Short mmCIF file of C-alpha atoms in Angstrom, two decimals:
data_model
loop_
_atom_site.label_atom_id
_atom_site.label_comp_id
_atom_site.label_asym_id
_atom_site.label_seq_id
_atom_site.Cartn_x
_atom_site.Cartn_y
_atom_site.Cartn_z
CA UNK A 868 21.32 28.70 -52.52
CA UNK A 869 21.19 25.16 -53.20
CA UNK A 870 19.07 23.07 -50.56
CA UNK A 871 22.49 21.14 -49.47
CA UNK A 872 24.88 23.70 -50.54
CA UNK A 873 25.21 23.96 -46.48
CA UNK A 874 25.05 20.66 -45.98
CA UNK A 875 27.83 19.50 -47.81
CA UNK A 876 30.31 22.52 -47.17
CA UNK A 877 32.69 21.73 -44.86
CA UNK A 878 35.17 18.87 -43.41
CA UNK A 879 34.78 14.94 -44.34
CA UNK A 880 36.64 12.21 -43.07
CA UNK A 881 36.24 8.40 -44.37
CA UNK A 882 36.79 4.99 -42.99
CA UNK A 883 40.35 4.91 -44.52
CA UNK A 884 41.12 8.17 -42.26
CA UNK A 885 41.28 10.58 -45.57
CA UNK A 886 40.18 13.86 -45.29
CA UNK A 887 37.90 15.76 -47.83
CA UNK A 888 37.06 19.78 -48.01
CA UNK A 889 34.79 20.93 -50.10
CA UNK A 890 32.57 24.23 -51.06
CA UNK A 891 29.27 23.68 -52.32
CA UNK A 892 28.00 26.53 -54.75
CA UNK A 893 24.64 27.38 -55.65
CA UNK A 894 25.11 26.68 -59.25
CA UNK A 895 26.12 23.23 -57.94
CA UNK A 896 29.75 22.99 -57.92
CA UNK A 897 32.19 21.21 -56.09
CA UNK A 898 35.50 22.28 -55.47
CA UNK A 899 38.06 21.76 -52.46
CA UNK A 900 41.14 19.48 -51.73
CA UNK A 901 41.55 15.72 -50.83
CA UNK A 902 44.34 14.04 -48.43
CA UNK A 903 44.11 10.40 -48.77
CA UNK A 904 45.61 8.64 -45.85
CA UNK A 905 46.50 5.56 -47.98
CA UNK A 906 48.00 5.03 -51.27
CA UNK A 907 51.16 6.59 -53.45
CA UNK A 908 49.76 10.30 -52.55
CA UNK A 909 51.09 13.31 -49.87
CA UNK A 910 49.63 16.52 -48.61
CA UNK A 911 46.86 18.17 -50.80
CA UNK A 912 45.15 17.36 -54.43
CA UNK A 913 42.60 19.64 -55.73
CA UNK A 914 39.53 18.25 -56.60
CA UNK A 915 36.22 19.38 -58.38
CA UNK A 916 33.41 17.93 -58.85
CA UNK A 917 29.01 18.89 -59.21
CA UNK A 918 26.15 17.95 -57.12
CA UNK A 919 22.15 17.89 -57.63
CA UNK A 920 21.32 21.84 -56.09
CA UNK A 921 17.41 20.98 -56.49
CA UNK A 922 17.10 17.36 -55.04
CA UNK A 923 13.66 15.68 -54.68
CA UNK A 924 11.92 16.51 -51.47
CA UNK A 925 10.47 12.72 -50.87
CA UNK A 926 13.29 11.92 -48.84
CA UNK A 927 15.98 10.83 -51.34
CA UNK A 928 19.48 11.39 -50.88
CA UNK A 929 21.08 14.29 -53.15
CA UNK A 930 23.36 12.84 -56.30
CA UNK A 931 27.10 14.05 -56.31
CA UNK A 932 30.19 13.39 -57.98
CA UNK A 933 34.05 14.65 -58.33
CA UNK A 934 37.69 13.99 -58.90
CA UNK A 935 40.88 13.68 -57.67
CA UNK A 936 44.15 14.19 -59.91
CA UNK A 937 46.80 12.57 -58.07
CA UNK A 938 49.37 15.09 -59.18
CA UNK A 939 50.81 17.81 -56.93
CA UNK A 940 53.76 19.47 -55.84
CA UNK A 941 55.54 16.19 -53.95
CA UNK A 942 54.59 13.15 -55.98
CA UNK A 943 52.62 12.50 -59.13
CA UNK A 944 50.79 8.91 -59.21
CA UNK A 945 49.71 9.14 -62.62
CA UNK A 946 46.11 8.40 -61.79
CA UNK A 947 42.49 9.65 -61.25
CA UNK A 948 39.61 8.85 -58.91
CA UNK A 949 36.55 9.84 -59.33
CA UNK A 950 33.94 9.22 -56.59
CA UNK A 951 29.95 8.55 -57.55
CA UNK A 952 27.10 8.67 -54.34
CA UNK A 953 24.71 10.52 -52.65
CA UNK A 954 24.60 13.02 -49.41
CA UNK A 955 22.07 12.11 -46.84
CA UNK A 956 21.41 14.62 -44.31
CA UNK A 957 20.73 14.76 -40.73
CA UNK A 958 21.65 13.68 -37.23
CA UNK A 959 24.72 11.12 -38.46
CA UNK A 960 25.02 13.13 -42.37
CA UNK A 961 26.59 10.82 -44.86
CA UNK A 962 28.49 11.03 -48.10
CA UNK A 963 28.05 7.15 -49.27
CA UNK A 964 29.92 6.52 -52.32
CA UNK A 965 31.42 4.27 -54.89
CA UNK A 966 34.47 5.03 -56.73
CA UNK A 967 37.00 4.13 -60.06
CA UNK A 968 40.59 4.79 -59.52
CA UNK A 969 42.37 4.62 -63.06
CA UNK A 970 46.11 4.80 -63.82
CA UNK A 971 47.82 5.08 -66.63
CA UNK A 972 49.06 2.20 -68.52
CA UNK A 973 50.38 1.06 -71.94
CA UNK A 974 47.59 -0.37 -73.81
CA UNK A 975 48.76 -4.23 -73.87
CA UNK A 976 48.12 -3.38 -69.29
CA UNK A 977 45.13 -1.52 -69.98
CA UNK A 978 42.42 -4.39 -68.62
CA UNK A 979 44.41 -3.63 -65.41
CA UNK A 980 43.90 0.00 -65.30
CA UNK A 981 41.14 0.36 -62.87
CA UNK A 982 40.15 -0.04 -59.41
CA UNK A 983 36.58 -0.02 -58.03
CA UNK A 984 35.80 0.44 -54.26
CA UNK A 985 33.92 2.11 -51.94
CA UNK A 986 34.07 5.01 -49.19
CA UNK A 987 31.73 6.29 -46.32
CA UNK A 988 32.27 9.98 -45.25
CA UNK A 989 31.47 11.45 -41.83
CA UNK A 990 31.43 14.95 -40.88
CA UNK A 991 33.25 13.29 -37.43
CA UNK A 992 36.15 11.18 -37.11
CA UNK B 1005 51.18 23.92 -71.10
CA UNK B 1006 50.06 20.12 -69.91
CA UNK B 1007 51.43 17.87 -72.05
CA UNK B 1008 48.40 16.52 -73.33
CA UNK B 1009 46.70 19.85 -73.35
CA UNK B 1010 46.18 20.17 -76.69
CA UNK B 1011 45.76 16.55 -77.51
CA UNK B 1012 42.43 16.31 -74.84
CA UNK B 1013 41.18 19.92 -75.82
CA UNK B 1014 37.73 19.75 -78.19
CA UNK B 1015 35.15 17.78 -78.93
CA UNK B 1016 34.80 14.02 -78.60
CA UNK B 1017 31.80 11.33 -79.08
CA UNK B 1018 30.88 8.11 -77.77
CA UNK B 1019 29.12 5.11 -78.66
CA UNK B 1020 25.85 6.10 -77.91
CA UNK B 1021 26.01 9.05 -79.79
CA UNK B 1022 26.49 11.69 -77.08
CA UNK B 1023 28.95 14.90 -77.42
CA UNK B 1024 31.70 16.07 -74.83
CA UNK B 1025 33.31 19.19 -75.21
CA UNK B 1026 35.99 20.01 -73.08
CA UNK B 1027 38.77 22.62 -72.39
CA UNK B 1028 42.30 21.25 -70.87
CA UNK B 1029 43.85 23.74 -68.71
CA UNK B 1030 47.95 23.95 -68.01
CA UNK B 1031 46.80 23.44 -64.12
CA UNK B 1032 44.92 19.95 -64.91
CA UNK B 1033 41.82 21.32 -64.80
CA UNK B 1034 38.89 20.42 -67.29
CA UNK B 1035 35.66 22.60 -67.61
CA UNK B 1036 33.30 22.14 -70.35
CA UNK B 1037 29.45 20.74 -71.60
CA UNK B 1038 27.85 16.79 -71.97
CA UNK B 1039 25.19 15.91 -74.28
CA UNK B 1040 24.12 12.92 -73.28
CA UNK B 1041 21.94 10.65 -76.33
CA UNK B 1042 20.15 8.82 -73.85
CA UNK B 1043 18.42 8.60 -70.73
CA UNK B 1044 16.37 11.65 -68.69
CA UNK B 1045 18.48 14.39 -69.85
CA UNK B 1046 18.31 17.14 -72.82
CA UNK B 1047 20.83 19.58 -74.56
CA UNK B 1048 23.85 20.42 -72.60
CA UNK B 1049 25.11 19.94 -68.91
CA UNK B 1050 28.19 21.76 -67.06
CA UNK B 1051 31.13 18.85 -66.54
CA UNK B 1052 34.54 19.36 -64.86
CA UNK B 1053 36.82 17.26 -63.71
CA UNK B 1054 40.95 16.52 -63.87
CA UNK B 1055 43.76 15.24 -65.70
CA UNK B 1056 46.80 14.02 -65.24
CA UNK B 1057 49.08 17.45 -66.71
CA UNK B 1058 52.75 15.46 -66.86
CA UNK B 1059 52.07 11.81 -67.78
CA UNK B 1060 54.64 9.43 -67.82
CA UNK B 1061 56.74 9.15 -71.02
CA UNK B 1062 56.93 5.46 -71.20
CA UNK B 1063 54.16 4.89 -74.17
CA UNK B 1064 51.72 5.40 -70.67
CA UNK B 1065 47.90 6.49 -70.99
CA UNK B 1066 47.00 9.92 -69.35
CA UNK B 1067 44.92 9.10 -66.53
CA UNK B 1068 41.58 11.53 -66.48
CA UNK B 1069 38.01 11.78 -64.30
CA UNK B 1070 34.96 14.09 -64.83
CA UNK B 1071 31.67 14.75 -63.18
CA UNK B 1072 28.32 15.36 -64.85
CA UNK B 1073 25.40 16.38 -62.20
CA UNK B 1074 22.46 15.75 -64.62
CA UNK B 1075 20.33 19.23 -63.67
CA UNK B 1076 19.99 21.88 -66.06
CA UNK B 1077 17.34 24.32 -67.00
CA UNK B 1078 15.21 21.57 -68.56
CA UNK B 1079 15.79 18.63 -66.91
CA UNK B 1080 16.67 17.40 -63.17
CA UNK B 1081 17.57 13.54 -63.48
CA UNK B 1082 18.29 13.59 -59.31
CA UNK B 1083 21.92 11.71 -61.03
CA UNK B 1084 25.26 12.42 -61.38
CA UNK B 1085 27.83 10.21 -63.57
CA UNK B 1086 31.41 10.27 -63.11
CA UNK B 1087 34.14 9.23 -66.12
CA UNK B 1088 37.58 7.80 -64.93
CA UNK B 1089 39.69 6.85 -67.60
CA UNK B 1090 43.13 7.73 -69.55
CA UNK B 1091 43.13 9.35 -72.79
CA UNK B 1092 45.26 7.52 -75.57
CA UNK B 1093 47.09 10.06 -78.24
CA UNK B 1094 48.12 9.56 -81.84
CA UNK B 1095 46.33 9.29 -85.17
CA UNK B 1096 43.64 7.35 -83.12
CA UNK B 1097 43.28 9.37 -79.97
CA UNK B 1098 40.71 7.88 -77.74
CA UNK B 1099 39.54 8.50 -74.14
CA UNK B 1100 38.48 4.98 -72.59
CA UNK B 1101 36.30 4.97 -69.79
CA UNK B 1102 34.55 3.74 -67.22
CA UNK B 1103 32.04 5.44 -65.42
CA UNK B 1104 29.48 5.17 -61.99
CA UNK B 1105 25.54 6.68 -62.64
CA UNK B 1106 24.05 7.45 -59.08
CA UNK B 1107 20.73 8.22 -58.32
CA UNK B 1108 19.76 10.13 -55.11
CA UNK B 1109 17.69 7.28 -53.43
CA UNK B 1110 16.10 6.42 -50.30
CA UNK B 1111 17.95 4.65 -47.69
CA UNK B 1112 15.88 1.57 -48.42
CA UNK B 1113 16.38 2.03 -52.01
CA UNK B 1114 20.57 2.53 -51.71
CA UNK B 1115 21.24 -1.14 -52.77
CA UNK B 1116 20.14 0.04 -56.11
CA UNK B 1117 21.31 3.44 -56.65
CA UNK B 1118 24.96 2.93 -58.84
CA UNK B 1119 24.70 1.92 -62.53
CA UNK B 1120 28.25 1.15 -64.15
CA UNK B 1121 29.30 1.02 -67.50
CA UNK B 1122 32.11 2.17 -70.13
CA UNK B 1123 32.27 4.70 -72.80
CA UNK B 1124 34.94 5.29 -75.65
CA UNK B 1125 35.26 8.51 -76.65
CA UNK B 1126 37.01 9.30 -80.38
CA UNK B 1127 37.43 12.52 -82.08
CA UNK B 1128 35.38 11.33 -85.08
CA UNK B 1129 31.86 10.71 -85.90
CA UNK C 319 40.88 -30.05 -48.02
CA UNK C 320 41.26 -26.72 -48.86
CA UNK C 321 42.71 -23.94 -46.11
CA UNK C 322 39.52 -21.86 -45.66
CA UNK C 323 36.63 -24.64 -46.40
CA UNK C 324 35.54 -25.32 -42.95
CA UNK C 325 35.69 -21.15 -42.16
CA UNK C 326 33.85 -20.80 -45.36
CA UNK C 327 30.99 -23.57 -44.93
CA UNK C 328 28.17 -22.37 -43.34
CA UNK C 329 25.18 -19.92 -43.33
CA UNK C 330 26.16 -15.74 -43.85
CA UNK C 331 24.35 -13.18 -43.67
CA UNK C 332 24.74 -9.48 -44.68
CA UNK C 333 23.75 -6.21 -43.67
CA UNK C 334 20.83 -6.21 -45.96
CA UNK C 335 19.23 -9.40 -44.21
CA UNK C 336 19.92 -11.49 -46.97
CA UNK C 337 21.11 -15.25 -46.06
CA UNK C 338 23.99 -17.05 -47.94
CA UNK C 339 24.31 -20.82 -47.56
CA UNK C 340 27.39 -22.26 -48.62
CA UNK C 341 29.19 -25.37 -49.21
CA UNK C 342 33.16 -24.86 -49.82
CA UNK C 343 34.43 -28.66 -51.72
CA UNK C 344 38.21 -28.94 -51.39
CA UNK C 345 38.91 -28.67 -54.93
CA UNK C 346 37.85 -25.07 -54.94
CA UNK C 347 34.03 -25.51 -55.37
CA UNK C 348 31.12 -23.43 -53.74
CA UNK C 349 27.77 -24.69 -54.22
CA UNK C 350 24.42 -23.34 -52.20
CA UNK C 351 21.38 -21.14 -51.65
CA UNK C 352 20.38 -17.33 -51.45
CA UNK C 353 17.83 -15.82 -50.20
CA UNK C 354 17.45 -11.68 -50.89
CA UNK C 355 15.37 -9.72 -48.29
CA UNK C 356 15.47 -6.65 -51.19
CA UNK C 357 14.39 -6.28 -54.78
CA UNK C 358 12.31 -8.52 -57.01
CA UNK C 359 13.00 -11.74 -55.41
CA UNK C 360 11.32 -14.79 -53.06
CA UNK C 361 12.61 -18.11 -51.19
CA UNK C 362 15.96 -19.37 -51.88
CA UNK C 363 18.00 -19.28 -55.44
CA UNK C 364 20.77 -21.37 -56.74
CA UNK C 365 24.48 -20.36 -56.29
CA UNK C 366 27.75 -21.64 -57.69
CA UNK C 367 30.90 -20.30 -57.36
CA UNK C 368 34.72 -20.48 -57.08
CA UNK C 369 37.48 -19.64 -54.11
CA UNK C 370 41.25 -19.90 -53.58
CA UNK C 371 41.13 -23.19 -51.84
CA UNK C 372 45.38 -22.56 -50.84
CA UNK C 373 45.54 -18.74 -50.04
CA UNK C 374 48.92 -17.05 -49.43
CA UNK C 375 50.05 -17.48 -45.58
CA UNK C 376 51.05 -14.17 -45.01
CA UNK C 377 47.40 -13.04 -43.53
CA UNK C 378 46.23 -11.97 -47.17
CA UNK C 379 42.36 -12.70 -47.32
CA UNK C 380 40.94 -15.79 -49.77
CA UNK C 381 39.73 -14.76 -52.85
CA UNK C 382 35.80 -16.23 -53.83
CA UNK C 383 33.55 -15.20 -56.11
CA UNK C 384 29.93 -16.54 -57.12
CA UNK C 385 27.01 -15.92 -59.25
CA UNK C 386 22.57 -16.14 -58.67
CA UNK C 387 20.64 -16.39 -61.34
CA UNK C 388 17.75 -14.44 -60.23
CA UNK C 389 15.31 -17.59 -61.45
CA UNK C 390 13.16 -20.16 -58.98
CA UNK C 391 9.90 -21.70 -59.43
CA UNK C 392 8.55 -18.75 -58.07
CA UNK C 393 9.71 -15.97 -59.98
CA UNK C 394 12.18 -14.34 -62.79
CA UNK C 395 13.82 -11.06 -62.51
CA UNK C 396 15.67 -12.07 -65.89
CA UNK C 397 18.71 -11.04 -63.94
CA UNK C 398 21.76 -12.43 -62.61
CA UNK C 399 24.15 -10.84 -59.47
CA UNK C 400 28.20 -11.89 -59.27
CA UNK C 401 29.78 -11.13 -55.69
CA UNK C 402 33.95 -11.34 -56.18
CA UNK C 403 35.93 -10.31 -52.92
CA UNK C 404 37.49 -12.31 -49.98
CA UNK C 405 37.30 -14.11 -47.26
CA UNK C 406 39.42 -12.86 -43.69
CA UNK C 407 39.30 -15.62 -40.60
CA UNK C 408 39.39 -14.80 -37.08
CA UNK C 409 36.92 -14.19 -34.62
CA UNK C 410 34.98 -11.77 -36.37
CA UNK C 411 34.92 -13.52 -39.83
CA UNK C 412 33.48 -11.92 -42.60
CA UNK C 413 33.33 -11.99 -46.89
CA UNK C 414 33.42 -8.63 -47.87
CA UNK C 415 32.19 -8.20 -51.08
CA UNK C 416 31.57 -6.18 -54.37
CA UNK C 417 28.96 -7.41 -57.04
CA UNK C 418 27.52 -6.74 -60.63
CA UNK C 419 23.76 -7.19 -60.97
CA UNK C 420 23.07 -7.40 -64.75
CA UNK C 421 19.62 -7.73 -66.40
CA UNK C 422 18.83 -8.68 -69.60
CA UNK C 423 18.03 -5.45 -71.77
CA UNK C 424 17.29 -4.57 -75.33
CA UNK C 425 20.03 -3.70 -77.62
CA UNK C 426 18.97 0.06 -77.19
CA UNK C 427 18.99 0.12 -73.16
CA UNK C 428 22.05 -1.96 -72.42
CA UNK C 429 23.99 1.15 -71.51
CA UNK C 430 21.71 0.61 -68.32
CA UNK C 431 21.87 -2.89 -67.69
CA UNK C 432 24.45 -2.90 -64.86
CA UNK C 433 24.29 -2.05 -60.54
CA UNK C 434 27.38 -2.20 -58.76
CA UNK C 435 27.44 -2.56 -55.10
CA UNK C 436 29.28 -4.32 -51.94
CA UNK C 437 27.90 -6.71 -49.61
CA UNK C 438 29.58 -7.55 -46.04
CA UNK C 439 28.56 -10.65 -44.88
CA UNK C 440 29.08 -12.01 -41.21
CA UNK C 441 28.17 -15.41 -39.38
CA UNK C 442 26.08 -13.57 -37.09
CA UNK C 443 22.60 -11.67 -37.37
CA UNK D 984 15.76 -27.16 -72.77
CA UNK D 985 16.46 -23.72 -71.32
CA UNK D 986 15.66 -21.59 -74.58
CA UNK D 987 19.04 -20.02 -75.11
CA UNK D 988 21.04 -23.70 -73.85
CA UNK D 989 22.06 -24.32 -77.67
CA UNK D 990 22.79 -20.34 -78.66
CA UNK D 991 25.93 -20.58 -75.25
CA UNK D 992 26.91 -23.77 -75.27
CA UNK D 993 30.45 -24.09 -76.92
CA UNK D 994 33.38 -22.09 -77.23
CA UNK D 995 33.96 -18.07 -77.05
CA UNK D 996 36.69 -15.47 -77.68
CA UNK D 997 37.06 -12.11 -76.12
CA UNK D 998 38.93 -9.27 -76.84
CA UNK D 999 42.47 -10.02 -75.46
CA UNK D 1000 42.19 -13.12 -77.37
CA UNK D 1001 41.20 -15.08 -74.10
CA UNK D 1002 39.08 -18.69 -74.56
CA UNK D 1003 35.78 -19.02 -72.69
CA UNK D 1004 34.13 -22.86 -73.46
CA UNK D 1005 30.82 -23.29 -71.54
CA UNK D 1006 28.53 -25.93 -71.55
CA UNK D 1007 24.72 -24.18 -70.90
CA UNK D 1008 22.39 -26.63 -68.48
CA UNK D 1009 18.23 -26.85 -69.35
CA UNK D 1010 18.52 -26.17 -65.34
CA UNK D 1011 20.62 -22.30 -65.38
CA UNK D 1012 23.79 -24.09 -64.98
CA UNK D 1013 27.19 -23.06 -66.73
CA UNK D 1014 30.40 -25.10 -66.37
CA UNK D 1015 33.45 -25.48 -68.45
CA UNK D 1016 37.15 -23.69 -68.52
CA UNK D 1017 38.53 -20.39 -69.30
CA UNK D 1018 42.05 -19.83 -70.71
CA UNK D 1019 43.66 -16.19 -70.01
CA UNK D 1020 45.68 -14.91 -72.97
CA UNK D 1021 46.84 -12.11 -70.08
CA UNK D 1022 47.88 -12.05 -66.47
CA UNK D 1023 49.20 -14.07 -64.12
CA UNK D 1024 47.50 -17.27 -65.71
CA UNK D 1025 48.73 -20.30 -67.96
CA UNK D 1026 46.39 -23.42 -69.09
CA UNK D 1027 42.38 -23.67 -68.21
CA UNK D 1028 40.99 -23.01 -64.91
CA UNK D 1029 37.03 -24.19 -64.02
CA UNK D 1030 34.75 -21.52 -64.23
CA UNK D 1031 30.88 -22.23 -62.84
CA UNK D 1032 28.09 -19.90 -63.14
CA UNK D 1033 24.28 -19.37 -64.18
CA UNK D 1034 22.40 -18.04 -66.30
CA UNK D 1035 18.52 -17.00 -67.13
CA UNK D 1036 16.91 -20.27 -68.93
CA UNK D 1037 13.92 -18.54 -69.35
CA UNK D 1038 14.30 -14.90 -70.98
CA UNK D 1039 12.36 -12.28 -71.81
CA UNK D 1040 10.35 -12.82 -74.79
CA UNK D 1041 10.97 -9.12 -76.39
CA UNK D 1042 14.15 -9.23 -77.78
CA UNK D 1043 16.36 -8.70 -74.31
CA UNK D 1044 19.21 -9.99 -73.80
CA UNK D 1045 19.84 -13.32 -71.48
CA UNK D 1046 21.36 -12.44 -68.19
CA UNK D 1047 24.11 -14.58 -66.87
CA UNK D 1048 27.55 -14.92 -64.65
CA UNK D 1049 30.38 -17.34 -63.85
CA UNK D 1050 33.58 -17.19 -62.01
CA UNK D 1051 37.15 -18.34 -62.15
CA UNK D 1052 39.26 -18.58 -59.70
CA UNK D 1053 42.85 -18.13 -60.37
CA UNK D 1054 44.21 -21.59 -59.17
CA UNK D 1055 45.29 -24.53 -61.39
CA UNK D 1056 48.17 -27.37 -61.38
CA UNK D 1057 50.36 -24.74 -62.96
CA UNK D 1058 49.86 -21.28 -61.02
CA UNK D 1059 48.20 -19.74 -57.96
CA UNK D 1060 47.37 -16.05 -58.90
CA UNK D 1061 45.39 -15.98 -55.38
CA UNK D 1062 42.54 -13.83 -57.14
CA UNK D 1063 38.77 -14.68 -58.50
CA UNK D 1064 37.19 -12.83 -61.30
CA UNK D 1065 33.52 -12.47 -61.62
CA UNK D 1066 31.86 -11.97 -65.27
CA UNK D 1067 28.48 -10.54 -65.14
CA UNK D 1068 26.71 -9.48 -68.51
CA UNK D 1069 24.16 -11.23 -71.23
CA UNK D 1070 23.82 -13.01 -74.22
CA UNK D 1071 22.58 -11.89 -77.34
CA UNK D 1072 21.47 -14.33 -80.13
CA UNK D 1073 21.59 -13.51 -83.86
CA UNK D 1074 24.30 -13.45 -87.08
CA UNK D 1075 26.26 -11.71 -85.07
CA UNK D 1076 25.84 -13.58 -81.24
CA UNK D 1077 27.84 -12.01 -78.80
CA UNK D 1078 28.14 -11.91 -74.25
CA UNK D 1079 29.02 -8.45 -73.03
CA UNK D 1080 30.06 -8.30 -69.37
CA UNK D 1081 32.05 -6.25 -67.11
CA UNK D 1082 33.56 -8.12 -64.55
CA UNK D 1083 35.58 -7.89 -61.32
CA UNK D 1084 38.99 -9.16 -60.38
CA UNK D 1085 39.38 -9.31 -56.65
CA UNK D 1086 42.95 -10.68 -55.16
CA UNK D 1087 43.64 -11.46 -52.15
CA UNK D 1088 45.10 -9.05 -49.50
CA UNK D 1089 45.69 -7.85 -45.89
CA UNK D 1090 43.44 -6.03 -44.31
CA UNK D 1091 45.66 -2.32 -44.72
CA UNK D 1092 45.88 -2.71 -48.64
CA UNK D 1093 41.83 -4.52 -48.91
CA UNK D 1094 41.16 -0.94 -50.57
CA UNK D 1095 43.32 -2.05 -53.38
CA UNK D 1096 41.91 -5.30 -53.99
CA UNK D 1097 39.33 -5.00 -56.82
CA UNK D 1098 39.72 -4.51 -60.71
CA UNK D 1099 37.14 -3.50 -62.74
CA UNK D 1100 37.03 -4.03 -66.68
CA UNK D 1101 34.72 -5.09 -69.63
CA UNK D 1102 34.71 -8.22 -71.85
CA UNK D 1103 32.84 -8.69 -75.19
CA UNK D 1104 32.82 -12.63 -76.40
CA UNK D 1105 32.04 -13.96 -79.51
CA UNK D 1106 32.29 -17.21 -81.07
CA UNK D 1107 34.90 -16.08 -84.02
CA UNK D 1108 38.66 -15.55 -83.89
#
């Protein structure tokens, strides 16, 4: 078992009203589906992604990653996010994170590929 | 097949020296190992992430992410580092990138958790 | 005078207790002080920056950016922070903000030379 | 004299053929213009920033920042960009940032606000 694995599994909502389900497995994966609430993007994108199974024990929050294709069955943006943070545990649990949103351009657009930005998930909202 | 399946499929290098091999599946999927040349890591870490299987045919980039969670049976760096870039085909193929390096932290700490930075990844050297 | 340079003017401070004092000049200047309650840092640093001083009218938020050199008489954390991100009026003003905090590195390390973050900053607290 | 004041001062070229000339203060002050080669940009625009007059004495880099924002006689691009990165002296001097574009927006599309990219200047071409 990883010492968030039961932490982290389960039903995340951010500030932007998107909604993020993930497994954690003891080998520290990631894997679930992502409905962002904003953006050229419908229903359900898979996502994957890894997390720290053995964090420190001095209180530190526990290192995690993944990404989001933003391909499906009803639209295809031609673009990836991937999101970069920590989960911190407890009372009001936390995923805070940072993340790059790149699409695909021609190379003459390509300094204009990539969005940065933040997100806070909550296990309520 | 992904159209870029092939293309993506193999192994690729960076700047620094580090090694990224990486399996393209028809799905968008992509499973494989990171070696990073620096930092608090040694010999090879799981990595998967997604790609963009049916890319716009306009001369566009393929848009890509992957996730690193820098634990393996040697090493726990408390970090994970996530890649979001497009990969470039032709006699030149590239993946350009820009990734986010988190640290699990304190709460006090937080402010300083996220490194950024950019790789380039050929099929060369 | 430009749109937002009395809203802008003033004293800010974020929601790490840090304190942002800021002159906006009608041509588009920002000149002032900062003081960081976090990291390697004491008494009040030089800033100089840049906003939109005629922002759309169509309730987008004013684009500003500045920069701290993280040298006084007092200390030098051979570093230097940029915020870039916008102003939004109203009765609950705020700058929300992302920044780069760079430090001077070797050659070898420079892969690591760069946090990324974002700062909110308010008129009250 | 702030030790690297001579080694900035003049005028530097990035990558996308863009036109940085600075003038380095003994006080951590940078002023001067920046012409875009890309975007939504024609002529010079005043950038301001600082930088570290008094570096590290073991070979690392000199920390610095400035800002533009995206307003002139010509063109209102309603946007700031922030360069943070250093300075390294030598044959072969060169600034390497990464920097962040923010534009301005409403509230419901502030997500969407912020590129990220990566500069490198020298003083030929």
């Amino acid at each position: 078992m990883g010492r968030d694995e039961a932490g982290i599994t389960g039903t995340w909502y951010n500030q932007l009203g998107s909604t993020f389900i993930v497994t954690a497995g003891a080998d520290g994966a990631l894997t679930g589906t992502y409905e962002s609430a904003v953006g050229n993007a419908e229903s359900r994108y898979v996502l994957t992604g890894r997390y720290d199974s053995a964090p420190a024990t001095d209180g530190s929050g526990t290192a995690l990653g993944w990404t989001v294709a933003w391909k499906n069955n009803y639209r295809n943006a031609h673009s990836a996010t991937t999101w970069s943070g920590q989960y911190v545990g407890g009372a009001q649990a936390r995923i805070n994170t940072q993340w790059l949103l790149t699409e695909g351009t021609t190379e003459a657009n390509a300094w204009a590929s990539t969005l940065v930005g933040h997100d806070t998930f909550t296990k309520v909202k």
